[PDB]
Amino acid sequence: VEVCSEQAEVGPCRARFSRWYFDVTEGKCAPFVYGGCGGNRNNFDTEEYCMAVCGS
């Protein structure tokens, strides 16, 4: 319910998906490389879905 403070996680799998995570310390979303599998819920398809769920 408060995953926005969880780190950006690539996970075990090895694709390169371009995803977005909320960077708690700069108050905005940033991109990270996501393996395609596993990880955490601080992971979203658009910079806009990310800000709508954890923006300030």
């Binding site: 075990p12 799998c13 090895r14 694709a15 390169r16 998906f17 371009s18 395609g36």
Partner: protein, 224 residues
């Protein structure tokens, strides 16, 4: 590919990449109209490129074909990564020649200790990220599926086996997934997962293609 080396042009005519905007996975051309990759590379809309060597410096001879069907294994499991294999049917059959060509399906399971070639345009570093443009290659042995489950307790299934070095420093990495591992001239596995890239006591886990030659063959006949 971490610790590997740059392939020579043409030497992997079966190595194929998947795209939707950017390069997100590798693949294997197994028949004029079919490609084999991993199931966690699924995307509703994929463009398959063939014959590539430098991803951002092309010559006239590559081939761009949009996937017209993407079939993931019915028994794929997103959490455990079970049966992490998938097929792609190309909207137009590939032109087979000196730089685009097929790979034989595996006629026997992968013998532990056997040397294999693993390739792909994946990240070159274990700390940080450096995604290369020129196709990379790595020569690695199959390991005993007893050390494989020692490395990853409770997480191996009948579909997976390990390739690489237990010392670390050499492995496949993000963007390699779905790419081929070829042993004694046939396709023995699809790169799948791993804890980190080329870390100590964490080699790459790959998908046992031999366990799927029956399913891969029925799928091509029920979509032809």
């Amino acid at each position: 590919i971490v610790g590997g080396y740059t392939c020579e042009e043409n030497s992997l005519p079966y190595q194929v990449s998947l795209n939707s905007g950017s390069h997100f996975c590798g693949g294997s051309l197994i028949s004029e109209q079919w490609v084999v990759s991993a199931a966690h590379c699924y995307k509703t809309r994929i463009q398959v490129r063939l014959g590539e060597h430098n991803i951002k410096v092309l010559e006239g001879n590559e081939q761009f074909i949009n996937a017209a069907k993407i079939i993931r294994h019915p028994k794929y499991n997103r959490d455990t990564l079970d049966n992490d294999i998938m097929l792609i049917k190309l909207s137009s059959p590939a032109v087979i020649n000196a730089r685009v060509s097929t790979i034989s399906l595996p006629t026997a399971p992968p013998a532990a200790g056997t040397e294999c070639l693993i390739s792909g345009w994946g990240n070159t570093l274990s700390f940080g990220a450096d995604y290369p443009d020129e196709l990379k290659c790595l020569d690695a042995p199959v390991l005993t599926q007893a050390e494989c489950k020692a490395s990853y307790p409770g997480k191996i299934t009948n579909s997976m086996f390990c390739v690489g070095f237990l010392e670390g420093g050499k492995d496949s990495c993000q963007r390699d997934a779905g790419g081929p591992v070829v042993c004694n001239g046939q396709l023995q596995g699809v790169v799948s997962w791993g804890h980190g890239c080329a870390w100590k006591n964490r080699p790459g886990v790959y998908t046992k293609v031999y366990n799927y030659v029956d399913w891969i063959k029925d799928t091509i006949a029920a979509n032809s």
